[PDB]
Amino acid sequence: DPRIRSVVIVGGGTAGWMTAAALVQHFRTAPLKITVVESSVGEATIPTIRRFYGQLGLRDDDVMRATQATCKLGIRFLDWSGPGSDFIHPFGLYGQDVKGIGFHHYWLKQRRAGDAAPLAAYSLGAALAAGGKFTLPSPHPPSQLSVFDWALHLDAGLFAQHLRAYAEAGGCARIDARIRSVELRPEDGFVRALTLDDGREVEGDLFVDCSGFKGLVIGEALGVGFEDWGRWLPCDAAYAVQSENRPGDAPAPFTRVTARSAGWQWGIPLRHRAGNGLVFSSAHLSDDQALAELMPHLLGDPLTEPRRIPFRPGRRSQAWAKNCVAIGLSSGFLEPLESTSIALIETGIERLKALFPDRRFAQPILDEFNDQTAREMERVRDFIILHYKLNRRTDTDFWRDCREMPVPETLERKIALWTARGQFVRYRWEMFHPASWLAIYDGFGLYPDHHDPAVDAMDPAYLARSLAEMRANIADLVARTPEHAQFLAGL
Amino acid sequence: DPRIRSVVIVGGGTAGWMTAAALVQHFRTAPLKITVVESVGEATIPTIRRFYGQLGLRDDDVMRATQATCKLGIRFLDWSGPGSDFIHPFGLYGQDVKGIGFHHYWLKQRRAGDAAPLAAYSLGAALAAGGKFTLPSPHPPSQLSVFDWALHLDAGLFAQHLRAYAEAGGCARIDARIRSVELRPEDGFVRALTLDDGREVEGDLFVDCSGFKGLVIGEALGVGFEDWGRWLPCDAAYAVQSENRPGDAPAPFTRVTARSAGWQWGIPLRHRAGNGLVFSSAHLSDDQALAELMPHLLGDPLTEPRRIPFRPGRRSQAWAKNCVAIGLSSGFLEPLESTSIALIETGIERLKALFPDRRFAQPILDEFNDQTAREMERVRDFIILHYKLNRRTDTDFWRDCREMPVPETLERKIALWTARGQFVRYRWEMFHPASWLAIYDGFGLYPDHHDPAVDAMDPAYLARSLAEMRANIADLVARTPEHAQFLAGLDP
């Protein structure tokens, strides 16, 4: 029977144990052996992660308790447009669409006629994040204005441990062991087995490489190459360090992303601790200069000294080769500017299930998986690039260069249709939907010349009052919502 | 103010008056002049009910005015050999489970000996086969009760209804032949139309609804044509209206019957029907064509058949300078899957979403041109598939269709379907995965292996869940009124 009989996941962490837990649930009562092989820090996410553990039978409160987690309503971008600049990228839409026309067009008309209200006054998500508030969104919500979503700041290590215990209870084997070698079949070149340090062999029909950046099976064993993207993205290094919260420091329901002289700093709040880091260009900063930016501005008392991490932006040339599928860092890397690492694991897993193979490993299945994965990486790359491309900082060469650097043609087309007409070019496999593009356009102050002319038919007095009603509903709803701290105290 | 001040629509019919009515509603109280300049049974997809929906019109009023009947899908007869019979509905099949598509569970059971057609799990299809009709529920218990519906209608009457709508909102109308198109000297943009009497009709924005010749997009502006006869064999058609015989209840579906070298259509109106044969002249003479068509009409012919040249393909760019082409002026695909009116609708929605100013910014044209091109290609490929998968042995026409090369975009779809039972998704598909499924199943092409999470389920448990679904539909159909009752509530 051509049926896959066994799955061997090479590496634990988030990638390995998310994969194990997801495959355990999906194939719970089927005759499928699943085994992980591994040896004996704060992170952000997007809302997809709540659905991921949702599908496993897990609750938000239980996962949050176990992972030292806090709520994430969006990301806060500080100083990207010059000293004091400040906007929030939320999970939600702005305002209410009318007659099929997007809200932002009516907002632009009114902005043209003198009104100075920020686009963010019409997003409940963003207003809640700025107010240090949190509440669960209503399902079957009164109207479009009250729709927002939310995600987690969490300990990735704890998250990995929680999913491990979940996977093992459903019958996933675990082998604590270093791997000496990967053995290939000499007719096919397919992966036959892993050889452990003690000489045991671990055979499998399907291998998932979660070994990390090195790529032990997809790269070293099978020779799959790497598409380097350093040419598009300047930054090439990072420092990270956990901090301990100081007494009377209420963690905020957002991630802080603060632009510095030659890169940017992150701030990921957990319940009693926080993730901190600086991403930067070594060609503009020494190691001591980097620490001089990072260390005086942490969200708390450092727990250790900073570790350096090499960044190498890009993607594995094919994420699936023969009978190896690469999930997580083994399949590529983009900096955490928009919290996408775990998200790329989630999409990889959903795709593996949607295209799960048999032992013939039919070439069209690999081709489709490889094609989706490639386009999706490129669509996230382009969103990340945009942030640098539209900066308005005058203070260093790093930032001028980012503003004048060439960018992929796919992003040129997006930027060009936005400034010409206020519309969105839509490709396949976008992680980020139109409202997220809008948040970045508006955050960097780039607006179209021409809004949609059906909008100029509306009366400026009538419009002005519909908008003030929206603006007020949000402000007053925010005002009466409890603080983030109260939801955390109930965990 | 760079604002468009005026719009001139060149040609009436469906393309011209759908455009006028849509732009009248969308720009109702704006200072925008709109003018049209001008001098048979058809099918649609459900988008058309939304189109006139957005205008403030009701299904019953439009149906009364257009001699219309209900359309639940299309019925394909004899494409797989004598007696073959399947329906492409507007709906999904069965109930998806645990994120896995219904068709995988159906395939597992089919593997184990059960012979129930995939169509037994579509309410839409079951209602069409049963000669039944009912409005779908607005807030339905589950996926099993969800279907949509469209119209068979008189296109001429539909054009007249929209004309009266457009004129009441302030659209000018000029009855006149056009002598020439005048181009402006710096830009080469269209300045004005010159009429037979010498009047000029000026505009900032021109819409070419002139038909196949392409008076502005083609003749005036020189935009070329991508011919697609290489991919699609048929190159001609005959159409003829028929009068219903007494005691002939029109069916709630379109009939598409394969013949020796092409196919016949049958579009029922309330007291009349559209009929035609699409075919390859390289395999059939004109008299051979009429010998297939004329003995098998849905009634007494109202005239003699007119021939129509078919030339499948698309205008190279649908928008050039300040001319947007809508309808036949932008391209042509045969009505195998009822897409003509649908392509006008998508063109109009796109024009509104990308409505320009007088600078005619190049990125707007480029996006419009790109969307339009891809969408035409996605409809072409769906049409091609129908010929590619035929199982007819009786003529050379049909062997060739089965062995003909097909675009790479379609090769990839067919390859992932047979390998894994999954759908390659491109941008701008008019037809969603369930429609592809209907064609794969109708021509008997199924994957080698279904999704293996499905084999976790017990064959006895599965067999009974499926028989319950199969029965819920059959019993819902059984108690639903006939098509005729809904039509009597529009009529005498």
Author numbering:
A (entry chain A): 6 to 45, 52 to 502
B (entry chain B): 6 to 44, 52 to 504
Question: What do the study's own words say?
Answer:
The structure of apo BrvH without any bound ligands was determined to a resolution of 2.5 Å. There are two chains in the asymmetric unit with no major differences between the chains. In the crystal, it forms a dimer very similar to that of tryptophan halogenases like PrnA or RebH. BrvH was modelled nearly completely, except for a few terminal residues and residues 46–51, a loop involved in FAD binding that can adopt various conformations in other FHals and is disordered in apo BrvH. The substrate binding site is only partly conserved between BrvH and RebH. There are no equivalent residues in BrvH, as a short loop (residues 432–444) replaces its much longer counterpart in RebH (residues 440–467). As a consequence, the substrate binding site of BrvH is noticeably more open than that of tryptophan halogenases and the ε-amino group of the active site lysine K83 is directly accessible to the solvent. The lack of side chains to keep the amino and carboxy group of tryptophan in place could potentially explain why BrvH does not accept tryptophan as substrate. The openness of the substrate binding site and the absence of large non-polar patches–which would point to a variant B halogenase–resemble the structure of MibH, a tryptophan halogenase that chlorinates tryptophan only when the latter is part of the enzyme’s cognate substrate peptide (deschloro NAI-107). The structure does not contain FAD and there is no halide bound at the assumed halide binding site, the amide nitrogens of T351 and S352 (T359 and G360 in RebH).
